[PDB]
Amino acid sequence: MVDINLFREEKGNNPEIIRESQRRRFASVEIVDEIIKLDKEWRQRQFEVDSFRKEFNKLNKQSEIIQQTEKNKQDSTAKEAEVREAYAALKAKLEQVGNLVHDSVPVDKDEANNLVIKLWGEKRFSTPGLKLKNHVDLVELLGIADTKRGAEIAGARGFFLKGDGLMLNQALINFGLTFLKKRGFTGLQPPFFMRKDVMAKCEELYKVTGEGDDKYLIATAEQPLCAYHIDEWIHPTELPLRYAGYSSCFRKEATLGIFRVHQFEKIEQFCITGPNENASWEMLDEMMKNSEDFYQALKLPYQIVSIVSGALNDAAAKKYDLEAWFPSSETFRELVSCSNCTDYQARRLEIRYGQKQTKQYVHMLNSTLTATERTICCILENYQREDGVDIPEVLQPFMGGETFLPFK
Amino acid sequence: MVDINLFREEKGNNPEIIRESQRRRFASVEIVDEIIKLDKEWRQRQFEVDSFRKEFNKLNKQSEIIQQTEKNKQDSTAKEAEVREAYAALKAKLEQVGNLVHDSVPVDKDEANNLVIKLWGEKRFSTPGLKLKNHVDLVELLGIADTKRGAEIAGARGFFLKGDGLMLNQALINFGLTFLKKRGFTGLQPPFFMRKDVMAKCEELYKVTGEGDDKYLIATAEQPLCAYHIDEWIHPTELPLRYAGYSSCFRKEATLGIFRVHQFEKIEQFCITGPNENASWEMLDEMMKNSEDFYQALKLPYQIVSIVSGALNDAAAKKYDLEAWFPSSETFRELVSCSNCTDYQARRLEIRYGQKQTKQYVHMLNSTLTATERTICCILENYQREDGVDIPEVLQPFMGGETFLPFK
């Protein structure tokens, strides 16, 4: 949720900023007045208690009187119930309000109008010499995934990684983790389980039943790496925090191919900053430079698009995608999303900024470095030859010096 | 299930072998006669069809006659139903019979009497200079797993791997995969999902709900690597097959420690052989030598125990455990199980041996190489110093040359 304080004229904050952000999200502007009207009620009860607190403690410092100090306690428990109700009803509207859309975000309702802002790399095309094959056919020819036997075993989109497929998957995971460890990141592998209560604050997911409470399978490392540091204080000397999240991922939405799948592995950049001095906006550039340097090391051409205000989800204040070149189909596909969600999750998760006045909260960002099966698919297409696939230079050490994967 | 043919005096096979194996499993010997009595019924119906087949086709080669060729079809569909019932009732008893216990297996009902057969390594002990800490306390001191934050997130026994904890986990996974790839193995990473129908032939597991049929989370790579090759023919030139299974594992049975946990990673040796020439018994030694060479490369002292006939599960014909030395508690704990299950799963999974007479079936074996979190725990205890933990020599390349993990 957003800071109630940014709706209060009282504290020297203009609620038009909220109204403008609603407009840019093509969402209710009327709700900003609804919330102001509710906040005011609630703060009156919040105060309408301390009226009967003082009048209660006023009687004290002395049945035309003894019956007066009776009702003033019946009051301060009756009115405390009203305060509870007000808080609750205020939660129901404020919950619905998206994060404040940064001004640099292109305003529009269709991702069709996503603003390309950067290009990189010399894109390969089908020549007369070699028709460029797609990832689906190159996985079959290389013999590095059993999607057929996978499908009988795990149901639809189910796949084994095999031989140099597993070595490659593992090569990319360790290349990514070392890549990021060199840039000040600490590895973190979360449990693939998470309690629904906790997921709430961070049903398009798998439910796992058995030991304890019903839990979800995680769609992204980003979800466990957000619950981590719940209810904690983080000291300014700790921030900024850089975690290289690693995990398997389970998506419900998706017998040939490993691009459009139910289970996959993923390195995530997850960063916490303090909420002042433009720190989170500086970290968003930092993480986006890291995503860039990495696809450049792999020598995969790409373009960076900024996401229209209309397409930002409720947590994101701003978002880029790195779309990389798939030469057989001459398309760019999404291999990175890079979000600054500022204090939106932090404030629900009571993740605070102080030593331990009025409450400050940390800023949190997330940026896929690589979804391995997707990155592989992109590697296959861009590195293919007449009779196999060359291995990118930087992955060659992690594959024991091998430079080539021949077709069966 | 076991080969019905080994219950038939008829084919030159002595059913006493079955009876003896039942004795060694301390299980029903009476059931071997029950099954013979059922098999005989079934084969009579199986034949009692071909009596009314020939008499039906006998009438043909000519209403004192035309009504005779009527009933002989009413028969051959009526008696075919009886054959179905016999087959089904025979399945219900034969299902309950364990695999034939190899003669080299120690006969006893208590694992207490497991026969140690081999020792290796110079075991470390608490000296006056250094009280040897346990894995639980060494994980806290090293700062390589958040079991506390894990527990709030994933419920009980839930843990993050962190910093050099993740690097180590990954070091062991890649050390194991290369270790095995050098010994003729092909990497395989299965889906962590598997359809209950399929699991049946390979409810102490997690159920996953969402897309498609209800599925289980796998307890071991061994389970998906068993369904793989279902209903297939394998050619003698293909066998023997060596797969290095890699996966996450989910066990229901288990906020400090990563040894006794719900989720963990595991390299498995899974091997298929032909069923003749003592091939599977030779492969069991091969896999057990591989498990040995690996804990020797890690320089972890261990002992090999042979499992008493009384403790073999229904698939295993024979089984060893490699128990490794945990010096703080001066105990050996199970880090490897090595099983030859011969044609027991193969025969349910219709995994055949021919080119493609009377049906031959492949032999299948499984042998944990490493459960990574457990192996780590064992590494921590055996490699500890006053102020940190040394990194095993062979894992040092995979950890970028680092030789030591200091306490926080």
Curated annotation (Swiss-Prot), chains A, B:
Q: Which GO terms describe its cellular component?
A: cytosol; plastid
> Top enzyme class of this protein?
ligase
Main localization, broad class: cytoplasm
Cross-referenced NCBIfam families, in alphabetical order?
Answer: serS
CDD domains in UniProt = SerRS_core
The record's annotation in PANTHER family points to: SERYL-TRNA SYNTHETASE (PTHR11778)
**What keywords are annotated for this sequence in UniProt?**
Aminoacyl-tRNA synthetase, ATP-binding, Cytoplasm, Disulfide bond, Ligase, Nucleotide-binding, Protein biosynthesis
Q: What is the protein name given in its UniProt record? A: Serine--tRNA ligase, cytoplasmic
Identify the species of origin. Answer: Arabidopsis thaliana (Mouse-ear cress)
Q: Does the keyword Transmembrane helix apply?
A: no
Domain annotation text?
Answer: Consists of two distinct domains, a catalytic core and a N-terminal extension that is involved in tRNA binding.
Per UniProt, subunit arrangement is: Homodimer. The tRNA molecule binds across the dimer.
- State the Pfam families in the record: Seryl_tRNA_N (PF02403), tRNA-synt_2b (PF00587)
Which Cys-Cys disulphide bridges does the record give?
Answer: 202-226
Binding residue positions for L-serine: 220-222, 268, 368
Q: Which Gene3D superfamilies match?
A: Bira Bifunctional Protein, Domain 2 (3.30.930.10), Serine-tRNA synthetase, tRNA binding domain (1.10.287.40)
A biological-process GO annotation = cytoplasmic translation
